[PDB]
Amino acid sequence: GSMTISFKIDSCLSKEGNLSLSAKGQLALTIEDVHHLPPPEEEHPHMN
Amino acid sequence: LDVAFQTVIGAYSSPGDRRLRCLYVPTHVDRITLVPSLCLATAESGCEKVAFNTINTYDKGDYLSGDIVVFDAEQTTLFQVENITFKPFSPPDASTDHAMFARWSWGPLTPDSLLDNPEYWATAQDKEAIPIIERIVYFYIRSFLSQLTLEERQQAAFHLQKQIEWLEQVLASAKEGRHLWYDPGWENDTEAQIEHLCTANSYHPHVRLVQRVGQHLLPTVRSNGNPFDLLDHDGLLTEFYTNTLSFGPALHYARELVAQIAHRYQSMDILEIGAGTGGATKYVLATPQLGFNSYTYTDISTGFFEQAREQFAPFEDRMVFEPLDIRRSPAEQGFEPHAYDLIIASNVLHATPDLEKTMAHARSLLKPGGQMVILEITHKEHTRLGFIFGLFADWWAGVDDGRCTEPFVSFDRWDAILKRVGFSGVDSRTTDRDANLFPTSVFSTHAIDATVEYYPPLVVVGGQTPQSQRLLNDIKAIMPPRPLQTYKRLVDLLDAEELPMKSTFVMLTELDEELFAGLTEETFEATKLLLTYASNTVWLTENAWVQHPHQASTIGMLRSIRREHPDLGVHVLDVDAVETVEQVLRLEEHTDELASSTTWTQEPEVSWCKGRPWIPRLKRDLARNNRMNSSRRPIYEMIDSSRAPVALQTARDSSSYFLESAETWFVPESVQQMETKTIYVHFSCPHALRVQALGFFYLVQGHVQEGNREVPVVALAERNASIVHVRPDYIYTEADNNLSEGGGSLMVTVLAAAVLAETVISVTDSILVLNPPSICGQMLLHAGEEIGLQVHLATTSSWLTLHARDTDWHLRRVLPRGVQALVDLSADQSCEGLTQRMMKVLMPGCAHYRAADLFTDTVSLPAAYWEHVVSLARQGLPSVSEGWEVMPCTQFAAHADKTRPDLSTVISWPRESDEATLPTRVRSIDAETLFAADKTYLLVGLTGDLGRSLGRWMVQHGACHIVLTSRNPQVNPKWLAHVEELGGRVTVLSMDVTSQNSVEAGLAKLKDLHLPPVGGIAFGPLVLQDVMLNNMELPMMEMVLNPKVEGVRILHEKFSDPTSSNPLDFFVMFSSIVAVMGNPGQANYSAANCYLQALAQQRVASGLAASTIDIGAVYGVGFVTRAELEEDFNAIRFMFDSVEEHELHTLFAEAVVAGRRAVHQQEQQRKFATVLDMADLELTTGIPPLDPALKDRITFFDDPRIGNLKIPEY
Amino acid sequence: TTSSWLTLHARDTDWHLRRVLPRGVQALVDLSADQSCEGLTQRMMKVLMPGCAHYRAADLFTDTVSLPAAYWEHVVSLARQGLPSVSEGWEVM
């Protein structure tokens, strides 16, 4: 029930330029064959 | 999602606070987690409007780190973000720095008449060298004089005086002129004697230059070549100008004089003529800060302008390069007449026979009252500089006056000539009492036009006190012919029926009963009447900032009045001792001197201290600004690590090590950590070593000054640095030379690692160690023998010579199967795969320890421990030499790497100031705990969002007990729980500081709450009535002052005992920048803030910690944020700068540190007996970079007190 | 727990762990049957005491194997305290 994916968003700003990395990372997916996150923290009492 | 990211920035920076001084874009995210089902459900359901929460985890400034949580209306988290590292689009250069901090840099109201500094006197070496060269010549100087002048005529006439334009006479006359010095029995041997003298310091640059010129002047003796280009274009000429303590101290006094002038006069359009190489320019601009609006680098020739541009690039924006021939009219050369407030003559007036006309040209360029700084010759002495000065090409031009060259004019004849050319005489001069300063003695002269007067009626109020009576009599006797009105007190003025509207008031009421101590008796209305009839005003106070805070309240009231009534010229004079005359009359005369186009600064306020006048200037305190910005960028400051704590901190990314300022800033808690010893580290281990479950501690070897003994010691330090403060338990105090320099620390480090490894594991009967340090192996074997444990050594290079990438089957074949624990000490991390394969072949469940589990770059005992460590080390000392791996801290920081921890490496911390004075990456003032856990910190008046933020910051910085006090604390108990989660017990006292009884009840309730004694107070109660004083009413004054004034008085009287068992670590009183510049309609507030400042200053003078912060508009939190006045205050952005919530915390921390430093220096016999000694206690803040383009909108730009904060325009 | 107990949650922010987790902890024991909590454990290592000992479920429970008499006495003495926590056939297959 997991899937680790290494992703890289390569970018090139012009047709004359080379393809360069713009973003990269990993993706860890909890998947099914077809409350997952912590409940949000209680709102801070004082807030301007 | 980008909006969610913007939430992090919003948390980091409030709207209008300008905390986000640079554009941050995301560059790394530790984790983004999204629940696609919930996001799709929200998208399809149409309830796009969703809630969010975000934590700005890291906000120092280098890169923001945010943790975001976006949830639906039902609080079902749609997605979250963890450590979304926002980083600047481009590195945060100094242009993005925040210059909020400022200090009251005090200086003389006029430049000192005599610049006699013992630090700049001719040293013994120079004072012997000059008489030594005299000894060569002094015998027959009387006969020499004329011949020496003849030789000095090499440029114009000496080549004909004896037909010395021809080869024979040239060769004869060169050596004859040198013998004019060497004749008395020394002669040619003087050639070698000169070198012998040059072998020592203070002899080389001068007499070596003499020797060099004496061996090549033959072509110049006949006037056929450049006098100095023959000397390799320079051999020592610049060194002679700078290094020699005859040409040097003149430049030092020039720097001092220019500093004084640029302090009293700021935004000056300066112009140095004859700079050449710019040595004088270098020295004068070496001042930490000076109020030069512009600096015209000028010389007769433009050949030096490239060198000036390269040397003075930092001041290039301030500096403009324009050639000028003072022998020629400046107007013909493109310069604007009377456009410069200051002109500097860098030893150039001697190079013109038109001295009078050149000085007239300088006057033409100078504005009325401008200062001409003259570095020039005077009071000639033949036996000291003659034959070497005589060579130059144009310096002799000037002999037309009848004396040698352009005459060595005496200061009296300098005064005569200077007056003849349109100036106010030589009122300042450099000391030339004995010698070595005549050749370059400096003088300052004012441009005499609309000169200081030294008619409208003069009104005197006060005179009740006997000293006030004496001063009134002195005013009467010294006042010029003017209409005069006199009143005993201000009530008498209130009873007055005829008061001129053009009155020039001289108020001595503060020397008598003060206004802000007796406002009840219609004194406020009398002050209103005064302002109504006051067009000019002078006020006198007796040590207000140190003895009489009420007089300081009056000073602040006048400070605000000068803003409310700009047409009303006001001066205030605070005197430490009134008995110590004649200066109040001159200030009163000045008040009528409303010169707008003249350089004369209007002197808004003055202080007579130590029998001398002083004027303050709010110069950016670059120390505190650098500390604040170090949180945001790598601020580097030259710090002496040998005498200041400098830790070789590891970078946040753990990419490299850098030297960081480790100054703890006087944390007073040393009883729980009993007798925290100070260690001056000579050698230390870069990596922190783990101990027996106690934690990671670096190994440091150094000296401890036990009754001045440099006792060698080896200790475990949490803050590896040049200087450490460590508990005695973690110290080995033996001075055994076997623990030799460098090597001893190496062995102790290795043995600490080995002992840790053996102790944590032992339970086991046999273990394995992978790639241990070369020294380590034998030590580990010794420890195993001493603890009865079979330790196996594995290395990737007896030892088991394994290899990285070895097959698991090979490991099974070779590795013993009795191992129960594995310890990987491999500095190279490539052996991680080998370790993993070991885990598959070793005993299942085998304990695994990595190098990170014993060695780390971040840290954040039984007496027998170090005894065992040293006993083990003494077994294996011979394994290596002492200096097996020794590198200086600078080399380690520049070249060492965290990812490759070179175990068994040792840092050689420099000890000499020359070796230790290094560029250290400054540390934020709040980067380390500043507060003790056994004391209560009382935030008086701090219960709004500002107070809550300050309290939470305090607890984050070691404040385990905080008390918030206010007349109506509306604090959520949930916030109290939140701060308690941070580790500090916070309570609301509901204490009305306005009443003594209420304060006493609250302080007794503290004991009822069992809280520790109050170790610090943050006094910031506030009430505002924005109305001008004339339209103000006494009840408003009472409402504004009583909270402030009465609260400070009550709290001081409560803690007015420096001998008490619980002296306050600090007494921070929250002042507004209006207390330093005023504001329209806040006279009461400014007076109260000045009362706070004066009370803090006198409390420090009393031996009690205290400080004041002159805060700007706090957009982040507090009055501006809670009143929703961001637009209104940003409309005056150019007037008051923003002070962010966390910047406010930084300012408070800096004020606390300043107070503690002042107290400790007082323990070091710092008197703090006057205002000058307490420039740091008033942490001026909130003044933005003053743009002249906005000078019209700025209602206080004309104030010279802020001169150094004015942006240059030309 | 990722479900007194500290009801943590997998994928919790390290800042939250700092806020809630006690700072006096010197050792961490991860018995999570579900291995998704490995990230939570890693984040714990960044907030707990540096050098904190770390034990995983594999360090206590394993599917491959390849004493003082008082040990079982202590085991049963402890078990007799908490027997009522569940029924006999809580999970029998």
Ligand SMILES: NC(=O)c1ccc[n+]([C@@H]2O[C@H](COP(=O)([O-])OP(=O)(O)OC[C@H]3O[C@@H](n4cnc5c(N)ncnc54)[C@H](OP(=O)(O)O)[C@@H]3O)[C@@H](O)[C@H]2O)c1
């Ligand atoms: N213009 C500036 O330079 C500037 C800007 C902001 C702050 N500051 C300084 O920072 C400190 C805190 O200011 P702030 O931001 O928190 O302003 P604020 O938001 O208006 O809070 C000040 C509060 O102190 C309360 N207070 C508490 N005990 C009091 C008493 N005994 N008498 C009268 N009022 C009392 C006032 O009434 P309540 O109890 O009902 O709240 C007032 O609301 C002040 O000392 C101020 O000088 C200066």
